[PDB]
Amino acid sequence: GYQFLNRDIFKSCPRIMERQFGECLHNRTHLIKDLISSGNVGLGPIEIVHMSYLNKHEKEEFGEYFYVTGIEVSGPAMPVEFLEVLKSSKRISKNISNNIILTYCCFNFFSNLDIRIRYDADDTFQTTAIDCNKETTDLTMTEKMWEETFASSVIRAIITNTNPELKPPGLVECPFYVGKDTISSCKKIIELLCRFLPRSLNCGWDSTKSMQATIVNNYLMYSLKSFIAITPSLVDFTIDYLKGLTKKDPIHDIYYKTAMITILDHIETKELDMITILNETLDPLLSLLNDLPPRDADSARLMNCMSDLLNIQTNFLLNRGDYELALGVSNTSTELALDSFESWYNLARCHIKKEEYEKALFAINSMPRRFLTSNYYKKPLNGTREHYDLTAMEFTNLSGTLRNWKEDELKRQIFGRIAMINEKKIGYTKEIWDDIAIKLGPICGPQSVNLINYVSPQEVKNIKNINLIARNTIGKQLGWFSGKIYGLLMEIVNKIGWNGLLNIRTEAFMMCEGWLDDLFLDLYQDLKLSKISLSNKDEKHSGLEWELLGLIMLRTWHWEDAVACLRTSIVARFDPVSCQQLLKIYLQPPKNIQEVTLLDTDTIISLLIKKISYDCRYYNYCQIFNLQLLEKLCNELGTHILRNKILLQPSIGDEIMVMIDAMLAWIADLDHT
């Protein structure tokens, strides 16, 4: 049953101990208040479940809470069932009172209301919509407000799942996509997103990737694309539904057309259709641009949108090797937005492909250039330090709430102020859960790009080559913008080399920003590091060292070398960072490689199993990326064969198969449509 899985998750959540009763919700409101006063709320905060308990002996009330995404909230029904399951499943001391208050909070970023569902000790529930800007203000829930809230929770769950940097330790992610009828669940979610397309510019955007929110760049459009990635059988359905929306709601046509175009983007089967819809979308726009003298705010919205679509064409032409046409649109696109990073970037690509490297360098020069809530968690650092922030009363209270748990076993599962207990053990495998996972802990947040900050301090100190660390620190981390640029520089180096690049620099002086100078030097040092060989020297190298070497090799495009190092780093212990890079290179192989095989499906299946196990340990039961992998494997091997290959693996027990069978079941359901 799909209910089976949900039940197990709801019973398997961690517990964070509130410092001061009330702090948790007071801080939530404060944080919302800030976001609203500042310019962008964005997605607002992740959903929270708060539990209020009474220690009988002392007169003291104490709280516990945890973070979660993926509960539906199309109305109170699903959150209430969840609260009901939580309360019914309690195991508590005689010293803990049976009066318990549970609150579920989900933030609606369309209305900027925090929806709080409160399940009382008398087992009755009340919902309030809190406007945090005007403190006292509570409203009543219209249908529209519920739909906005549903949409908020779904967008937030997709965006969060797909970016590890946004996940707090111990975050519980539910498989929002699962349901009674798989196909109907997915359709429900798709139609929800599509109907909300007109309000997409209110959905926040990632400013790493874009200056302003655009019809093309915003969280809603991103989440829709991410979801469609795992539901390819629903593409034709989706294009139709939008075709239908544009008929009922013609004033919003631009939004619906843009969604058609971005959904079909990068699907080779659908290129003729994409090109055709772009055509119908763009031509009207040049007209509508010249028919406003006001320069009304709608003028920037449209020019941005027009440039974003043109970018899509440019990219398409470039990928197909037609540089003359690419340069044609690429010109038009850079005029309409001089503020557009993407426009200059493609303009640089065009020049690079036409081998005119000075113009490219000019283009590059021309380009345009959060949450604190982790006090509760302490990293284990490979067993080299103790992580316990609890006081004795805090622990007494915690234990009272979890009677079924042996106290010493409980103490071992606490990391700082959070109890990382996972009771139903879904996803369990011995090698992962009883060894490597305990060491290291969840890998998420800004530090999650490598293991430098998760591993033994001694292990880092042991690294012979200082540059190896220095080029991989969280500070010197590249980031979307400079990463894209570094890429263009690599393209250039591949042709004429670093010395060549450097001459091009001074040719350009004849006809240079400091941030660019800094990249040249970074690039140089990375190329050097790339040449290094850690093998055959009768020198012992740690996993961390292999992993860092591999990340550098990816960066410099030495693919085989990178795969080799990354695998080597996994030999002595599991490395969630290296593993993910391996799966990613299988899922999305580099374009330059000539349909080369970097990894064989047996190796992939092995890694994929461990990764699913690692993810499940820390509550990620959603795993959109891993589904994408399973989907690719089912395409190659077939579903039944793939299942057998999984069953043949020695680490596989029943707990992990619950999870895998669910994911496989869902993928299978999608094949009939």
Q: String of b and e for 33-69 (b: at least 16 CB within 10 Å)? A: eebbeeeebbbbbbbbbbbbbbbeeeeeebbbbbbbb
Q: String of b and e for 408-446 (b: at least 16 CB within 10 Å)? A: eebeebbbbbbbbbbebbbbbbeebbeebbbbbbbbbbe
Of 276 and 635, the one with the shorter C-beta distance to other proteins is: 276
Of 299 and 477, the one with the shorter C-beta distance to other proteins is: 299
Count CB-CB contacts under 10 A for residue 589: 15
Question: Exposed/middle/buried for 536, CB within 10 Å: 0-12, 13-18, 19+?
Answer: exposed
Closest CA to 213 of 42, 32, 410: 42
Query: Which of these segments, 181-189, 254-262, 360-368, 452-460, binds other proteins (CB under 8 A)?
Result: 360-368
Query: Which of these segments, 77-85, 320-328, 385-393, 580-588, binds other proteins (CB under 8 A)?
Result: 320-328
Site for other proteins in 167-196 (CB under 8 A): none
Of 236 and 283, the one with the shorter C-beta distance to other proteins is: 283
363 touching other proteins, by CB under 8 A: yes
Q: What is the CA radius of gyration of the chain?
A: 26
Enter the tokens of residue 204.
Answer: 């926040």
Residue 325 CB, nearest approach to other proteins (Å) = 6
Residue 295 CB, nearest approach to other proteins (Å) = 5
Chain breaks in the chain (C to N over 2.5 A) after: 369, 511
336 touching other proteins, by CB under 8 A: yes
Of 295 and 537, the one with the shorter C-beta distance to other proteins is: 295
Please state the length of the chain: 673
Tell me, residue by residue from 74 to 113, as one string, x for binding to other proteins by CB under 8 A and - for no binding: ----------------------------------------
Site for other proteins in 7-36 (CB under 8 A): none
Residue 310 CB, nearest approach to other proteins (Å) = 10
CA distance linking residue 543 with residue 566, whole number of Å = 9
Tell me the number of residues near other proteins by CB under 8 A: 37
What is the residue type of 667? I
Residue 599 CB, nearest approach to other proteins (Å) = 32
Of 186 and 303, the one with the shorter C-beta distance to other proteins is: 303
300 touching other proteins, by CB under 8 A: yes
Tell me, residue by residue from 137 to 166, as one string, x for binding to other proteins by CB under 8 A and - for no binding: ------------------------------
Residue 338 CB, nearest approach to other proteins (Å) = 5
Query: Which of these segments, 313-321, 408-416, 497-505, 538-546, binds other proteins (CB under 8 A)?
Result: 313-321
Q: Which neighbouring-strand residues pair with 51?
A: 64, 102
Q: Which of 123, 240, 335, 356 forms a contact with other proteins (CB under 8 A)?
A: 335
Query: Which of these segments, 78-86, 294-302, 605-613, 661-669, binds other proteins (CB under 8 A)?
Result: 294-302
668 touching other proteins, by CB under 8 A: no
Q: What's the angle, vertex CA 146, arms to CA 145 and CA 147, rounded to 5?
A: 90
Residue 202 CB, nearest approach to other proteins (Å) = 23
CA distance linking residue 521 with residue 516, whole number of Å = 9
Closest CA to 216 of 288, 286, 333, 304: 304
362 touching other proteins, by CB under 8 A: yes
Query: Which of these segments, 291-299, 458-466, 532-540, 616-624, binds other proteins (CB under 8 A)?
Result: 291-299
Of 208 and 319, the one with the shorter C-beta distance to other proteins is: 319
Of 273 and 423, the one with the shorter C-beta distance to other proteins is: 273
CA distance linking residue 536 with residue 534, whole number of Å = 7
C-alpha pair distances (Å), 557 with each of 321, 478, 530, 585, 593: 20, 15, 9, 12, 10
C-alpha pair distances (Å), 87 with each of 62, 122, 181, 424: 16, 12, 28, 16
Tell me, residue by residue from 465 to 504, as one string, x for binding to other proteins by CB under 8 A and - for no binding: ----------------------------------------
328 touching other proteins, by CB under 8 A: yes
Of 317 and 549, the one with the shorter C-beta distance to other proteins is: 317
Of 304 and 556, the one with the shorter C-beta distance to other proteins is: 304
Query: Which of these segments, 16-24, 36-44, 94-102, 358-366, binds other proteins (CB under 8 A)?
Result: 358-366
217 touching other proteins, by CB under 8 A: no
- Alpha-carbon torsion angle 483, 581, 492, 338, nearest 10: -30
Of 41 and 360, the one with the shorter C-beta distance to other proteins is: 360
Inter-residue contact 198 to 595 (CB < 8 Å): no
317 touching other proteins, by CB under 8 A: yes
Closest CA to 311 of 355, 278, 289, 280: 278
Closest CA to 62 of 70, 50, 74: 50
Question: Exposed/middle/buried for 614, CB within 10 Å: 0-12, 13-18, 19+?
Answer: buried
Of 280 and 636, the one with the shorter C-beta distance to other proteins is: 280
Of 335 and 654, the one with the shorter C-beta distance to other proteins is: 335
Inter-residue contact 10 to 90 (CB < 8 Å): no
293 touching other proteins, by CB under 8 A: yes
CA distance linking residue 673 with residue 235, whole number of Å = 11
Residue 603 CB, nearest approach to other proteins (Å) = 35
Q: Which of 329, 440, 662, 663 forms a contact with other proteins (CB under 8 A)?
A: 329
CA distance linking residue 324 with residue 345, whole number of Å = 16
366 touching other proteins, by CB under 8 A: yes
Inter-residue contact 353 to 337 (CB < 8 Å): no
Closest CA to 264 of 302, 237, 304, 284: 237
Query: Which of these segments, 37-45, 299-307, 453-461, 587-595, binds other proteins (CB under 8 A)?
Result: 299-307
Q: What's the angle, vertex CA 230, arms to CA 256 and CA 144, rounded to 5?
A: 45
448 touching other proteins, by CB under 8 A: no
- Alpha-carbon torsion angle 322, 324, 327, 328, nearest 10: -110
Of 282 and 604, the one with the shorter C-beta distance to other proteins is: 282
Of 294 and 475, the one with the shorter C-beta distance to other proteins is: 294
Tell me, residue by residue from 251 to 290, as one string, x for binding to other proteins by CB under 8 A and - for no binding: --------------------xx--xx--x--xx--x--xx
512 touching other proteins, by CB under 8 A: no
Query: Which of these segments, 211-219, 250-258, 332-340, 484-492, binds other proteins (CB under 8 A)?
Result: 332-340
Question: Exposed/middle/buried for 116, CB within 10 Å: 0-12, 13-18, 19+?
Answer: buried
What is the residue type of 230? I
334 touching other proteins, by CB under 8 A: yes
Inter-residue contact 86 to 10 (CB < 8 Å): yes
Of 86 and 302, the one with the shorter C-beta distance to other proteins is: 302
59 touching other proteins, by CB under 8 A: no
Please give the residue ranges that form the binding site for other proteins (CB under 8 A): 271-272, 275-276, 279, 282-283, 286, 289-290, 292-295, 299-300, 303, 313, 316-317, 320, 322, 325, 328-329, 331-332, 334-339, 347, 362-363, 366
